[PDB]
Symmetry: C3
Subunit: 228 residues, 3 copies
């Protein structure tokens, strides 16, 4: 339940808060329109994560879900976080490669399904069913990764070389980090429970900070965010 | 409760899933920007419906609401579905006639009110009050239908004849199908309960598949989605 | 609990409904694209508020929250209202000064955090924690007010003098009214409880009608909404 993992929740809260402040201050020295958008998007991501990590730390974002004949602690606040932060991260990537509206909607929509079905799975009372939702959510994730490689990368090359290289790195970072989430879910408290909640929380914290703060540091330090 | 109607929920799940896959594959042979948008929007609709129909089939999207001195089974997942799919359908229509941002916001906003108030009515514990919400939701629906005829049709004519004819058909399809929803709600388990949940579920399934898959088939088979 | 304050909820419901109808009818005599957007945005605000005020009046938007060792009545419907109406009001201001996408996203995002954290605070079971959320929400509000003065006003001056003057008035109206909300929350039933729910409801009603209907009357009566 909500106790051993408190340290990872506290560290997550602190790291997201610090990241938000760093991006906020760093963005003060920016007036370029396009550069503005990237800062706005990128700063909102850890700001949201900060509030949800704090909600979990304080116990608000935690609930008990019956399944497997047991009362299992489930941090639902994560999904509220991801619901808004994952599409924002996708928007950063899309804006970078100047994706068309159609592809953006496809990505945001698939992302919404990914998080929504993940939440349904996390709160499902029938054990076996939890994995059905996991599969559907994973399929949505694969769709997103597909678009990022066969509907994005190809266009990034048709853009400025500075944009292409920054997109390629952020793209690779996204694919590696995002793909780890379903694995942690599958092995953790929400899934088969091979890994305890304490360790599951630690894993998500490392992934979240990297996917948000790490991702943001790479993007906001790049010249790709400016139109030159 | 959740049993007799299982067959309609299973059929709905299957039909939405098949529709989503068909649109997904069909869209692979498309690269045109504007055509892209229509495929993205139209494929997301049954994809979302698929997840919610499955949630109902598995029992997750079902809840018990006290009213009329009874414990009434209410499938709340429908509203989560409609909250996102109805405005997407409206966006398809709006994009088709190249509606201005102002009208799109008006439609999306009215739609949000329609579904939101429908949900409030569906979960209201005071019988007579349920119909007050039904009336407000219906008023919002009438607003939407009004705009589609006196704020859309008139412009579709000012566009390409291919767009005008496809819009006219989809418009007519929308008006006929959407108008049936409040009637089913009024006579079904959420309303006066003249029709049993089993039959109510069947009716919504026929309406949903037609309004989503049927609607999509007409749109995506049209040349109106391309700019020529 | 839900009784003495019924009159303020009924008055709020009536005033929001009347405002919505007035804006609806007033907007009929408009065909200008940009003017359209302002009417669509501005009419949706009181329309949404109307539904939520009615939900509170009927008892649906009310819930009991344990804290301070007591069962405290909390009208959660307010946050559902504000979640959608505050960013819409910000959009009116942003459209007026032709703000760039980056700033709009920053405002909408900060607003989402403001309302979200306010809701978390309103439903928190640990008394002292409620004020932590209040502080975070207030910080988000201050960010919004900052942008409206150092990221908006400066640009409004670079626009038509009619737009600048209307923005300045609406800006001032927004800053004064919005700043009162955290104070009412802090002194009312959601906070330290120095003011009874009855009076708290009255205060929010006066603020809401002014910030929505009053704000709208000023905007929609202005020539600033037209491009000339
Ligand atoms: C420190 C926090 C907690 C509170 C901040 C408010 C106080 C009053 C200080 C204000 C000064 C700022 C930190 C300056 C940075 C932003 C400037 C450059 C924007 C100027 O206008 C432009 C052109 C918009 O366009 C660009 C905006 C971009 C540079 C910043 C993106 C941030 C955005 C997504 C909003 C984040 C919202 C939080 C800050 C809300 C508070 C946090 C919550 C969780 C409580
Ligand atoms: C089969 C499903 C379950 C999983 C699919 C993922 C795997 C890896 C296969 C990938 C291949 C695709 C089916 C190819 C079709 C899309 C191509 C043309 C886009 C290319 O880029 C463009 C230009 C975007 O712009 C256009 C997109 C448009 C052609 C498709 C619209 C679909 C969109 C709304 C997203 C739907 C999301 C689901 C697919 C998510 C999974 C379902 C959930 C419920 C679990
Ligand atoms: C009176 C209400 C309850 C129901 C109204 C429906 C019936 C059928 C009457 C229709 C006539 C309207 C009142 C005319 C005004 C709108 C016209 C000018 C738009 C034309 O097209 C343009 C160019 C869009 O673009 C502009 C729209 C703008 C002039 C109006 C903005 C309103 C918008 C935000 C939607 C509000 C939604 C409510 C009306 C929904 C009902 C309320 C709920 C809470 C139940
Ligand atoms: C987006 C924007 C807002 C960014 C700015 C964030 C911020 C202001 C700067 C960054 C600094 C971090 C968040 C570091 C603080 C996190 C803590 C060390 C967490 C552990 O505390 C708890 C341990 C030691 O356990 C002790 C025992 C318990 C039961 C006591 C309860 C303590 C609790 C209420 C502290 C939370 C307050 C933090 C998160 C900051 C508030 C933000 C303000 C703006 C209001
Ligand atoms: C491009 C654009 C169009 C966007 C794309 C679509 C979008 C972004 C993604 C697609 C949407 C998701 C895949 C749908 C998942 C949503 C969940 C099933 C809703 C969770 O309900 C909640 C859980 C906790 O349920 C709890 C169960 C019980 C025990 C609680 C009882 C209370 C209940 C009756 C109230 C529910 C009110 C909600 C569901 C109404 C609408 C939900 C919205 C979040 C949509
Ligand atoms: C958007 C995108 C994802 C589209 C792709 C969808 C899909 C993969 C292709 C389309 C095919 C359909 C969905 C047909 C399957 C539906 C079933 C026949 C429903 C009835 O099963 C139940 C009956 C016979 O009752 C039996 C007794 C019960 C208690 C057993 C529980 C069975 C249940 C868990 C099956 C649901 C799984 C389906 C919906 C498919 C999963 C999708 C994957 C991607 C994970
Ligand atoms: C253009 C743009 C601006 C968009 C236009 C606006 C938009 C799209 C449409 C307008 C919005 C709707 C008409 C509002 C309806 C929302 C519902 C009243 C909220 C349902 O709450 C839920 C039900 C199930 O309530 C359950 C009651 C109890 C028993 C549950 C107790 C838990 C409770 C305290 C938590 C509620 C948390 C929510 C309501 C916070 C915000 C809600 C959001 C969905 C907005
Ligand atoms: C956006 C759009 C929709 C705007 C249009 C709104 C509207 C149609 C016009 C504006 C007029 C106002 C809303 C005035 C009505 C409000 C009432 C006086 C509130 C008090 O009633 C209650 C007192 C006296 O207590 C009596 C005892 C109780 C227990 C009886 C229950 C009465 C309750 C069900 C009335 C609510 C219905 C109102 C809000 C209008 C419905 C809108 C329709 C479109 C369906
Ligand atoms: C620019 C763009 C990207 C947008 C910017 C971001 C956005 C607009 C603002 C930022 C988001 C907020 C600050 C986050 C606050 C949301 C709340 C913490 C969620 C409330 O949950 C609800 C309360 C009542 O909780 C109730 C607690 C228990 C007792 C209920 C048990 C049921 C529970 C398990 C179901 C919860 C389902 C939800 C939370 C899933 C997602 C939530 C969405 C609303 C995001
Ligand atoms: C760790 C990271 C998230 C930063 C955390 C910062 C923290 C929250 C505080 C933020 C504010 C500070 C003052 C730092 C800002 C100052 C500098 C400009 C940072 C320099 O890095 C500047 C650069 C360019 O940026 C890139 C730095 C790299 C490390 C980002 C890569 C992200 C990701 C792909 C790393 C992989 C995941 C990790 C945790 C390893 C897991 C190992 C497994 C085998 C288990
Ligand atoms: C029934 C429909 C939803 C399709 C269901 C498909 C299903 C989910 C599987 C999807 C994938 C398949 C392989 C089909 C795709 C292949 C073709 C291109 C289809 C050809 O139709 C191609 C065409 C052009 O399209 C138009 C076809 C018509 C039938 C659509 C009209 C929708 C609507 C207005 C019908 C009315 C409602 C019905 C159910 C009748 C109710 C009667 C009342 C009196 C009760
Ligand atoms: C009170 C207001 C919200 C209007 C309520 C209207 C009501 C809901 C019905 C709507 C439909 C009606 C038929 C009115 C429309 C007709 C006219 C065009 C109105 C003329 O005002 C036209 C003009 C130009 O507009 C501006 C009028 C001013 C009064 C708006 C200023 C808003 C705000 C900043 C006022 C401060 C708050 C108040 C309540 C004082 C609190 C005092 C404290 C010390 C406690
Ligand atoms: C800041 C957070 C980030 C970048 C979060 C990413 C989350 C995902 C890619 C989550 C995916 C999931 C699945 C594929 C299946 C099971 C459910 C989820 C939600 C864990
Ligand atoms: C895929 C789903 C579609 C096209 C759904 C459409 C739903 C409506 C037009 C629903 C309308 C309702 C009312 C007018 C009043 C009562 C409540 C509703 C939600 C059934
Ligand atoms: C129609 C409603 C309007 C304009 C509402 C505005 C609301 C705010 C500015 C609310 C702010 C809050 C805080 C700053 C802190 C405590 C929580 C809130 C939600 C009361």
């Amino acid at each position: 339940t909500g106790r051993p993992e408190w340290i990872w929740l506290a560290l997550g809260t602190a790291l997201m808060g610090l990241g938000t402040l760093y991006f906020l201050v760093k963005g003060m020295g920016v007036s370029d329109p396009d550069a503005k958008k990237f800062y706005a998007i990128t700063t909102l991501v850890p700001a949201i994560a900060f509030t949800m990590y704090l909600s979990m730390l304080l116990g608000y974002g935690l609930t008990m879900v019956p399944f497997g004949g047991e009362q299992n602690p489930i941090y639902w606040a994560r999904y509220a976080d991801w619901l808004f932060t994952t599409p924002l991260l996708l928007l950063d990537l899309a804006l970078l490669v100047d994706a068309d509206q159609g592809t953006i909607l496809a990505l945001v929509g698939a992302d919404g399904i990914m998080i929504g079905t993940g939440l349904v799975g996390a709160l499902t009372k029938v054990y076996s069913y939890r994995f059905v939702w996991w599969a559907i959510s994973t399929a949505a994730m694969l769709y997103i990764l597909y678009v990022l490689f066969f509907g994005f990368t190809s266009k990034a090359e048709s853009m400025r070389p500075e944009v292409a290289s920054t997109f390629k790195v952020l793209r690779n970072v996204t694919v590696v980090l995002w793909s780890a989430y379903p694995v942690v879910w599958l092995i953790g408290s929400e899934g088969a429970g091979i890994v305890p909640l304490n360790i599951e929380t630690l894993l998500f914290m490392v992934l979240d900070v990297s996917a948000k703060v790490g991702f943001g540091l790479i993007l906001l330090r790049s010249r790709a965010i400016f139109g030159e």
